[PDB]
Structure 1
Amino acid sequence: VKIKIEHLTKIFGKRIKTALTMVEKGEPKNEILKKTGATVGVYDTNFEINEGEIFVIMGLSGSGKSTLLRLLNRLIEPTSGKIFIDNQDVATLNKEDLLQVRRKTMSMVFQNFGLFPHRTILENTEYGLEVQNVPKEERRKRAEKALDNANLLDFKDQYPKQLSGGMQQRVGLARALANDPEILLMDEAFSALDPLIRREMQDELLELQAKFQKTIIFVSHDLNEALRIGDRIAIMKDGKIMQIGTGEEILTNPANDYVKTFVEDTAENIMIPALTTNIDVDGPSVALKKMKTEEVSSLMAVDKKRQFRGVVTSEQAIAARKNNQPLKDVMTTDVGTVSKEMLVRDILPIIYDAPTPLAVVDDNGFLKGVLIRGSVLEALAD
């Protein structure tokens, strides 16, 4: 255990003593609002955290999650509650100690990376120490080190705006790490990047946490971004609906009825977007390029008029290429093609025969999607 929270909360607007007394009894948020006009962002929040225990915090825009972070850092003064870190409360600290804490223990990362465009990446990296009144030698040393640890040092002594979002994110992360903090607050950090860079950075962060075991408040509105890394998740709708974490307990034993609509817990609506190849125009080399980009081994084949035609395989394409032959001949028109609305145990005996999926072709030849073992899931749900 590292952190511990007690009846923490935060209230905005005015006439906040009445709202405090209200929440001291259990007054819902809407009623408090109507009666006082003091919008609440946090409500009787109680939980704890351990070391290396990445504690994601989910929710929708308005669940008042980033607010909880800025409270932990005390950037926003808590209306009430306590925060017992290292046997040291945080809401009852003077200015000096709070600053030393922010300098030693905690460090933040932000959505748009919170970078000073009027500086060089090195300077933005070392700021956390600059404000600690330390010599420039070790400042620059730790900076260069953290940057080498992110494989962008050479891009130093430049400015942010001339970089890519991913690089600036790595930069803010190095800025936060330089201090060797025991904690890392993150407010939808990777939410501004491309999903590809997003996954890359998720894995890099996991590698880091493996090397250095330090606690992390993460935040995000994407359940996958949490499940990939989260060791103990906490969902949030103006309150701790569920914080047990475990990743699955949220899915295994979702206590409330709103989490289950958040995680999206009988028809074959599972048809997924398909990967097409208009044989009438494109060729084997093109199909191979597509297989490469989409990162797959086969593809679906249609007509110039979007009419389903069949299936293609990597080897079939390579053979048509070597032979110089075209498509529409080296194909597999024999397929377990299916219709949009059927049972989950309909193509049960064939789904195993066809290694390739079973395209859900429209009645009129058109195509919608495919099925790859996502039918098994809901088929066994009965």
Structure 2
Amino acid sequence: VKIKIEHLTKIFGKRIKTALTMVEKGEPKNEILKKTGATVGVYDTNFEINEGEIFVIMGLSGSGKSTLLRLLNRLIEPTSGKIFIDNQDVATLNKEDLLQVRRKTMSMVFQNFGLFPHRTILENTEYGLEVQNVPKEERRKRAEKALDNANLLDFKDQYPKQLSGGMQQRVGLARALANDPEILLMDEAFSALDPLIRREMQDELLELQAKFQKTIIFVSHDLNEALRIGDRIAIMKDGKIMQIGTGEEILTNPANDYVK
């Protein structure tokens, strides 16, 4: 296995330890988020992600689905928990080791494409390397190959504002890929596209994964697209994982009608 989680916890607001332990009683989060006012992101999630798979993550919009991601790479400081990768726990790292992690191992993809409008394609896509102090020629070549693998090297001098939602997403994915990461995080990557280009990006992602294998984590809200991508799906609600079913999620329905 490439990833191993151990009791991941994220709680906002003050009363850090007091609220953490008072909720550690295991009560439904609704009570503490409604009355006591202590917001909750997750609660004691202990799962894992094996190499060369797709651990999709569902959850109604507002159920702490992307917070788990943003915790994996520490875009939000997790209260307590452990994320063992490459025999390394991330939460117990200084800025240097964490930066090297983010540089070489993990890299995200964003809903609104998280693109620098003031920088052109061959300028953005190379960011993942520019940050690494990479030879301009080498990073340029890597960017251009990451582009032509998506068939956009022709537009290597335009600006994002002059492109399409699907093209912007493909450029974001090229930026994520040029760094050649062992892990690929995707947070609602296709939540702003049309169904047909959505499905097209899905097929592109699958063909690339099958061709180039690497661990993927994926957030989404449709079960159909998921099962189209789902190698190990795991839905979430109230900030709590409930299952890790590939073809059984839709079979077994533990305390959930949303599964249909």
Q: Give yes or no for TM over 0.5.
A: yes
Indicate the SS of the match to 2:19. helix
Over aligned residue pairs, what C-alpha RMSD do you find? 1.4
Is 2:235–2:243's contact at 8 Å kept on the other side of the alignment? yes
Is 1:44–1:239's contact at 8 Å kept on the other side of the alignment? no
Give the superposition deviation at 1:119. Answer: 0.5
Structure 2 equivalent of residue 95 of structure 1: 95
Give CA-to-partner distance per residue, 1:293-352, whole Å, 9 cap, x none: xxxxxxxxxxxxxxxxxxxxxxxxxxxxxxxxxxxxxxxxxxxxxxxxxxxxxxxxxxxx
Give the superposition deviation at 1:22. Answer: 2.2
Whole-Å separation in 2 of the counterparts to 1:203 and 1:90: 32
Give the superposition deviation at 1:212. Answer: 1.2
Whole-Å separation in 1 of the counterparts to 2:120 and 2:112: 17
Whole-Å separation in 2 of the counterparts to 1:112 and 1:34: 30
* Matched ranges for 1:59-208 at <5 A: 59-208=59-208
Indicate the SS of the match to 2:42. strand
Seen in structure 2, the aligned counterparts of structure 1 residues 103 and 211 have a Cα distance that, compared at 3 Å, is: same
Give the superposition deviation at 1:94. Answer: 0.5
Is 1:10–1:42's contact at 8 Å kept on the other side of the alignment? yes
Give the superposition deviation at 1:29. Answer: 1.1
Is 1:250–1:259's contact at 8 Å kept on the other side of the alignment? yes
Give the superposition deviation at 1:45. Answer: 1.1
TM-score by length of 2: 0.96
Whole-Å separation in 1 of the counterparts to 2:249 and 2:237: 18
Indicate whether 1:230 and 2:257 are aligned: no
Whole-Å separation in 1 of the counterparts to 2:116 and 2:241: 37
Give the superposition deviation at 1:257. Answer: 4.5
Is 1:242–1:255's contact at 8 Å kept on the other side of the alignment? no
Seen in structure 2, the aligned counterparts of structure 1 residues 241 and 250 have a Cα distance that, compared at 3 Å, is: farther
Indicate the SS of the match to 1:184. strand
Give the superposition deviation at 1:241. Answer: 4.4
Whole-Å separation in 2 of the counterparts to 1:81 and 1:168: 34
What is the aligned length? 260
Gaps of 5+ in 2: none
TM-score by length of 1: 0.66
Whole-Å separation in 2 of the counterparts to 1:249 and 1:111: 25
Give the superposition deviation at 1:35. Answer: 5.1
Give the superposition deviation at 1:258. Answer: 4.8
Give CA-to-partner distance per residue, 1:254-276, whole Å, 9 cap, x none: 4544534xxxxxxxxxxxxxxxx
Is 2:45–2:241's contact at 8 Å kept on the other side of the alignment? no
Give the superposition deviation at 1:17. Answer: 1.3
Give the superposition deviation at 1:52. Answer: 1.3
Whole-Å separation in 2 of the counterparts to 1:71 and 1:8: 9
Whole-Å separation in 2 of the counterparts to 1:182 and 1:199: 24
Gaps of 5+ in 1: 261-382
Give CA-to-partner distance per residue, 1:108-146, whole Å, 9 cap, x none: 000010000000111100001101011101010000000
Indicate the SS of the match to 1:8. strand
Give the superposition deviation at 1:24. Answer: 2.3
- Aligned-pair identity in percent equals 100
Whole-Å separation in 2 of the counterparts to 1:116 and 1:257: 41
Give the superposition deviation at 1:250. Answer: 3.4
